[PDB]
Design a protein around this nucleic acid. Structure first.
Ligand SMILES: [Mg+2]
Ligand SMILES: [Mg+2]
Length: 350
RNA sequence: UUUU
């Protein structure tokens, strides 16, 4: 539904559902959605899901290692009761193996898992996505009714741990991510700009305010790796880095949110990228690849096809899987819509 | 293009 392409000189209007949230009192996140989201980091239903996954799959893979990992918005603390649950099933100590493109061994495991879900009475198979970069099974866990995305890739679990450390260290980050997440949904932009992408933009914004560390700062070398990617981070106390941990009040949340939207309304996406790995302002698309760690340089030297896709309208770099522009699918019209909504949202916050 |  691109009116933007036809009338690029016209600001695409902020949807009313979004307008009414922004214009309305922001207290909902501070007093209602945050307690829900915090409680959803741990609930008994997750245990049932993990247990049922082990019961279902252990026969098919008779005596090999099997371990289930939870990740996604629920685990980091920005989920809601309708959120799905993302799960990484490690079969055969596959955790530390990174697959740029899903290997045949990986895809083979996924096809076998599919049949178990159909046959089982406890699960309802929804989708089988072998073609996606991260192949997943979408299935409903009928006992709890919770929709699950099952994958064989450990990177999601790894960046969920990073997010959880950030949120707990600097709770303002969590409040902001819950707000922009709901904003994104009311703006109907989730198909282009994901919740995860906007979380990285919030973290990067807060890094520029000297309230969060650069992720590279937390990885000075021993290192834990998933292929060429450094997935461990030093859980340094923010006091040790001089980072003050703010008391998140409605006024302070509202001020950072307004500055967040204002910043990305005026951000130069043509020459710069969102870079929580470097965590410094004005990180140029032209110089980013030379600022990455030796394992990336080594990895792209032998595999140039695996380098980060920088020839896109919007570049947001995953701070761990440094070869991943998480906004690579955003179109110039989708970006323009995002910019317009940011602009109009910043105004409504004053 | 589809998890994060
Ligand atoms: Mg999820
Ligand atoms: Mg999911």
């Amino acid at each position: 539904q691109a009116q933007v392409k036809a009338r690029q000189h016209i600001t695409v209007r902020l949807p009313k559902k979004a307008r009414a949230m922004i214009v309305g009192e922001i207290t909902n996140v501070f007093k209602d959605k945050y307690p829900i989201a915090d409680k959803l980091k741990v609930i008994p239903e997750y245990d049932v899901i993990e247990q049922d996954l082990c019961k279902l799959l252990s026969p098919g893979f008779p005596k090999q290692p099997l371990r289930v990992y939870k990740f996604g918005s629920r685990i980091t603390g920005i989920g809601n009761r309708s959120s799905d649950l993302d799960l990484f099933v490690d079969i055969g100590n596959t955790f530390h193996t990174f697959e740029h493109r899903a290997s045949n061994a990986t895809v083979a495991k996924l096809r076998a898992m599919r049949k178990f879900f159909c046959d089982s009475e406890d699960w309802r198979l929804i989708n089988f996505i072998e073609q996606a970069r991260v192949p997943i099974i979408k299935t409903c866990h009928l006992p709890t009714g919770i929709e699950c995305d099952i994958c064989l890739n450990s990177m999601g679990f790894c960046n969920t741990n990073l997010l959880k450390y950030i949120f707990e260290s600097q709770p303002l980050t969590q409040y902001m991510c819950i707000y922009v997440k709901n904003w994104l949904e009311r703006c109907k932009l989730t198909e282009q700009i994901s919740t995860y992408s906007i979380t990285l933009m919030v973290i990067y914004f807060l890094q520029l305010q000297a309230l969060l560390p650069p992720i590279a700062m937390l990885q000075i070398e021993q290192a834990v790796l998933v292929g060429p990617w450094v997935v461990n981070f030093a859980q340094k106390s923010f006091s040790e880095l001089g980072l003050q941990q703010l008391k998140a009040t409605v006024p302070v949340i509202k001020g950072f949110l307004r500055n967040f939207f204002a910043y990305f309304a005026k951000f130069d996406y043509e020459h710069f990228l969102v870079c929580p790995y470097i965590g410094q302002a004005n990180v140029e698309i032209a110089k980013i690849e030379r600022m990455l760690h030796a394992r990336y340089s080594a990895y792209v030297s032998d595999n140039p096809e695996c380098s980060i896709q920088l020839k896109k309208p919007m570049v947001v770099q995953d701070p761990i899987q440094l070869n991943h522009n998480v906004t690579k699918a955003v179109t110039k019209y989708g970006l323009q819509t995002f910019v317009d909504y940011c602009q109009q949202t910043a105004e409504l916050l004053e």
